[PDB]
Please model this.
Amino acid sequence: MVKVGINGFGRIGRLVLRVCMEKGVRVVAVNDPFIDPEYMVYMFKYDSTHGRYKGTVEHKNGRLVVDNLEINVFQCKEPKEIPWSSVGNPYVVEATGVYLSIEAASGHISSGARRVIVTAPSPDAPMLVMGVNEKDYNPGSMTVVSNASCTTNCLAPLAKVIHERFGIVEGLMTTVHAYTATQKTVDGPSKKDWRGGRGAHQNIIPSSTGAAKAVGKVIPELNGKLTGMAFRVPTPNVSVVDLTCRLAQPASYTAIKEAVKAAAKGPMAGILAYTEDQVVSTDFNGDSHSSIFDAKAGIALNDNFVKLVSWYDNEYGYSHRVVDLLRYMFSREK
Amino acid sequence: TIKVGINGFGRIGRIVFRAAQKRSDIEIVAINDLLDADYMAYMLKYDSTHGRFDGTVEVKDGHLIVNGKKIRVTAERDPANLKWDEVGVDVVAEATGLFLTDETARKHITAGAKKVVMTGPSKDNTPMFVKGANFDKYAGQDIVSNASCTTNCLAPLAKVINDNFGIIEGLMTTVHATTATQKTVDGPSHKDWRGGRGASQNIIPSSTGAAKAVGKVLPELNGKLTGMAFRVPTPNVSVVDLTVRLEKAATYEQIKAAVKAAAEGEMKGVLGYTEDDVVSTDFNGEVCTSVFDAKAGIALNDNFVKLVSWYDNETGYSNKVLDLIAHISK
Amino acid sequence: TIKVGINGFGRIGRIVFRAAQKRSDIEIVAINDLLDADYMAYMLKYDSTHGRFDGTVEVKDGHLIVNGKKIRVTAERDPANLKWDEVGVDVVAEATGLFLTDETARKHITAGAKKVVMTGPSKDNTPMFVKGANFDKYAGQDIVSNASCTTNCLAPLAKVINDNFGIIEGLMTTVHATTATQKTVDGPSHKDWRGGRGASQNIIPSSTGAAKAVGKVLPELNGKLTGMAFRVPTPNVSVVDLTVRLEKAATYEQIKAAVKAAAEGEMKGVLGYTEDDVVSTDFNGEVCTSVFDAKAGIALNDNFVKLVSWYDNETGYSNKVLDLIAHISK
Amino acid sequence: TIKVGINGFGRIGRIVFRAAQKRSDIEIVAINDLLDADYMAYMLKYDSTHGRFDGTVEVKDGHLIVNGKKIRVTAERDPANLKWDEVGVDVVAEATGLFLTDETARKHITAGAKKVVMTGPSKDNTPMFVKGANFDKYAGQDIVSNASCTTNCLAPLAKVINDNFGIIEGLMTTVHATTATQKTVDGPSHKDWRGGRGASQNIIPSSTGAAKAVGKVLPELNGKLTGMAFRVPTPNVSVVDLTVRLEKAATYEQIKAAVKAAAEGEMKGVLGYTEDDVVSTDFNGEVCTSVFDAKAGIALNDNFVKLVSWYDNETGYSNKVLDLIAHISK
Ligand SMILES: NC(=O)c1ccc[n+]([C@@H]2O[C@H](COP(=O)([O-])OP(=O)(O)OC[C@H]3O[C@@H](n4cnc5c(N)ncnc54)[C@H](O)[C@@H]3O)[C@@H](O)[C@H]2O)c1
Ligand SMILES: NC(=O)c1ccc[n+]([C@@H]2O[C@H](COP(=O)([O-])OP(=O)(O)OC[C@H]3O[C@@H](n4cnc5c(N)ncnc54)[C@H](O)[C@@H]3O)[C@@H](O)[C@H]2O)c1
Ligand SMILES: NC(=O)c1ccc[n+]([C@@H]2O[C@H](COP(=O)([O-])OP(=O)(O)OC[C@H]3O[C@@H](n4cnc5c(N)ncnc54)[C@H](O)[C@@H]3O)[C@@H](O)[C@H]2O)c1
Ligand SMILES: NC(=O)c1ccc[n+]([C@@H]2O[C@H](COP(=O)([O-])OP(=O)(O)OC[C@H]3O[C@@H](n4cnc5c(N)ncnc54)[C@H](O)[C@@H]3O)[C@@H](O)[C@H]2O)c1
Model:
């Protein structure tokens, strides 16, 4: 009986709706002042990356209708002006990338949202990564939470397993990352990130991440012990983390593999996966896991110095986690 | 010398700039966009498609020093605020994509420029000029358009075909590189739904007024040509695919000979001619606005034929903007 | 059920294999390639274009087990050595691209199979059949060709347009996805120089026999159509751009109505019709061999029009290979 | 003047050829591949990555004429048949990828050549040489390897870091451009299953001995480095991402200073240094085999750091192949 409202009908917003449909989570409304109901029908029905929506999508009376389920469409610029009250005061998935802080996201609370999940890192909202620290959620004090970044959702579950079994002394991460909507088709203006303005399809582009540092927030023992960066590359979806770490306890690569397998089969099922296959990025397009450990791509120099590789669908895997988190949060209502 | 201000330091703006460095009749004295001088320097210096800038660029006192010369940098959103007169600008290359009517483009004249060349098709009755078609029809007008990249490819070819054999009717497709108007991943493009889809993932049908526009620069072809586009995952260089019905019977060898003669003749530097096994990257940096691909074309018969012509949508068009600037300043 | 063997587990081989699992009339019992069983399992399970195999695949001992079913895996370079009869194969899907004449394809029949469907246009007098065009002209022949992906797109459309309005003459372009014959970077392709050039970097002009081959499956159109191709940097899905002169005058609305009627009628499952703002990825996985794009097409007049039709060159073709397997064994 | 023959006119063979035109110490006098001279001419003339050839190429009497210089063209699969001494070849650039052991490379010497440079890491104990690392260790051996493009990027950087701060241990990733060994669509690569997956669709993990090989050209670093690769959909230019633990504590600024001093000093022309906001295409045509990207790297602490260095895998390596040829001829 959770009800969800989506703010921002973009890559994340549309695929969050898709995952909601797949799981029987009722989405009651979508707000996006840049996409009208008819255009919403088009954007949701056809997807270059994830294929046609498998079901029906129609517009009727200014509503988005998906598999005969009617979704109210709002067209409001400001969170505090969105009529969340008119659609039963749902949880709000904040997926615009514009309202990131507790203060900005709290605009939804004013207009009737019961809780807000920011689908990105926030300067101040508590980060919750399913499988890592979701129990940190305190419904008594937290109306606005962050589901962290896609990369953090990949790195953290792996980091947890490795750190708990062997101890991570220090780590440096690279993520080789698919391009996204913030990038440009041809060299264009990106005042705040010059490299990120260069043509997305022509280039390997060094890029900044705070994901590795953010892992030290959700796993406090790792605070100060990880940092990293990214390379943006000409793929449309799916990314991979490349974690180089020093371990406190000696660990053969077989021991590492067995620890990941156990976590994957047990307490992190559905979050962390484990493979030994000769996979590539497209093998995880549409994969619901936060992190798929690639056993054969990794390499150890010695029992204390290893490079680990884990895949993630930054679009659809992350959207699964948004939905998992709001369902978990709803389960915690007193 | 002709003093040029560039409004919009985008793909066209910056490639117009580079092309101006190799001309002595034209110097760029000022650049406007929505960006700091240091970022402008970076955007000039490095180019994913055309490589590093040939020469020196530095920032000094909030302005650019390019190959020794100071270029004023401004960041005015409203062209009327541009004070083009302060740098004695003759002609503005209007390359933002935002000011394609007389009314909007005239803000530059208000701001002190003498004339404006729109680096795109005019959205009103502002006259369009395509080198090799109708430059000589320029009549002292203060605001003009250089048409589109596709019209610049199509018109020269169409004129040669029509002058020699008579185009009864023609339909055109342009298989066209990705541009700045497209999106990296499926995103909002409310005026053009298809145009919002991931540029690198898709063949994307697109609308073009380029074939109709040929009718405006070559009135004899009015109503005889229309067409469309497919946008494809390449960063630059496009190709015209022209299907024409010919009045006068012409063998493919005769079509080849007519195009070659115009290329070496009255259309030298506009229309080019090749018989090599070329692909799109072979024209990256091409200055000719229409390069006829002899081996790629195909005739069904002597009156029904498919012609192919390449163009660097960035470089070819940018050179012709300068050509138009020089022409209207004669 | 019809027992089928695949020769060549490439793009077509594998996609035929996937489409066969959905069918009750056809069972794949054996595959031949130059590959180990484990590698074949790998290639089937994971697909960059079409995602993971919907089902189970195992190599037990052994022994390719797909959806509980044992598949014989052989590695014979020479089709004569196949021993099809040993696993009871009726029909061979010949998908190597290497055995496209009766002489070569007949090796399957001497190896114990009853009939052969070539998954490409024959290089000799081997009859071609295109579903929606001339399946009913099949006359018990033991070796047939399903023609090309492009022919499968153009033929059904051409037939509908010809039947209704009379095609005087037409010229075709296919804007086509890259395929296995191309190169990742500029490499050797001695029979097709252009096709050696970096696939992901270029628009690559290419010869095609698909429009002429329409004249074979629809004899009434012999010598009336030709065309060519542009290979572009997309992994799958292609589009036909057909420029036609019509005998009987037809508005675009009458063209649309005619295509829609055939799509809902006699050509259901072959010819499709859409009015949506589609792009290529929207047809990745499309079973229809020719999906007419209403909004994309354009008419100059009632007798001269450009028509646009989509096809998943991998999936559509592969489904029709199976449709031909079914038909010839009725 | 050192006379050289190229065996394998592929990416490296053709970029080596272009790099040699600018040298006074080296002349290419003969090329062998599996192609006709006219095709060879076409492949030289046009390049998707590096543009059209800067100069004249012609075919006469079955051989090449490049800027008025006659070049012998042969098409022998077997190096033993090459008769290198009939054209006065001193050194063969061995660039097929096929002949990377002494036994196979030696056939060139048998065929009359004096010395051989393998354009790839040796598969046996054939000594490897990397400029900036160990050219001075060369001892007149008649067969040598210039190692890999990646080792050429890593070794010069690793040396500077080791000499100044001491590398305790290091792990390397190279994010690497697509190359000729890869496939345009999911295809057979029984050697390297990931490598058969469509190059333009995927990030593709790849194993590499490049980090280990640094221990061969810098024995002080033996056993201290290893790594892997990710292949990505770019046509050219790659980057090293080196994660190292340091014996002596060093700020990131002190690292930058050390690399810069070497780039301006001992490693000049080999190791480059930049502080600009560069991306891969900014190094297309780069001659330095390692360009340190100061802004891209990151330190966790004074002893644990991630370092970033670019290389044009085609151009940098090809230039150092010529450097090695010059060096062994001194
Ligand atoms: N794309 C990814 O791989 C990814 C993964 C994880 C998290 N995220 C995060 O999720 C957020 C959205 O990312 P995305 O890729 O979907 O971006 P997107 O550009 O695809 O979508 C953003 C959407 O927000 C809408 N929007 C803008 N202003 C709005 C407002 N005033 N009110 C309502 N809607 C508004 C836009 O119309 C657009 O549809 C960002 O914070 C991003 O960092 C992205
Ligand atoms: N790219 C091509 O192949 C091509 C070819 C021919 C014509 N054109 C035309 O040229 C024009 C621009 O094309 P482009 O590809 O360079 O686009 P672009 O996006 O690369 O360039 C637009 C530039 O204008 C700037 N800008 C936006 N608003 C501004 C303002 N108010 N004042 C000053 N600058 C502003 C942007 O920051 C950007 O740098 C368009 O009309 C386009 O149709 C493009
Ligand atoms: N892919 C398409 O869009 C498309 C569409 C229609 C028709 N076709 C046709 O289908 C045929 C195959 O095309 P593809 O795209 O699958 O090519 P492909 O390269 O993907 O498949 C060819 C397969 O045949 C195998 N093979 C080579 N020699 C063999 C031998 N002698 N014995 C057994 N197997 C052998 C290869 O290992 C490879 O797996 C060609 O005739 C092609 O023209 C392709
Ligand atoms: N491409 C790179 O970034 C790069 C960089 C450094 C080193 N290398 C190495 O250089 C070598 C060649 O690589 P490439 O990328 O140029 O590959 P490539 O495929 O482009 O070139 C191989 C060439 O050799 C020809 N050839 C094949 N067999 C032959 C034979 N028997 N006799 C004569 N010629 C024959 C082929 O036709 C082709 O032109 C490999 O060892 C590779 O690992 C490549």
The CA atoms of residues 127 and 146 of chain A lie 5 Å apart. The pocket of nicotinamide-adenine-dinucleotide (ligand 1) is lined by residues A 7-13, 31-35, 77, 95-98, 119-120, 150, 180-181, 314-315, 318; B 187-188 (CB under 6 Å). Chain A has two domains: 1-147+315-334, 148-314. The domain at 148-314 of chain A is CATH 3.30.360.10 (Dihydrodipicolinate Reductase; domain 2).
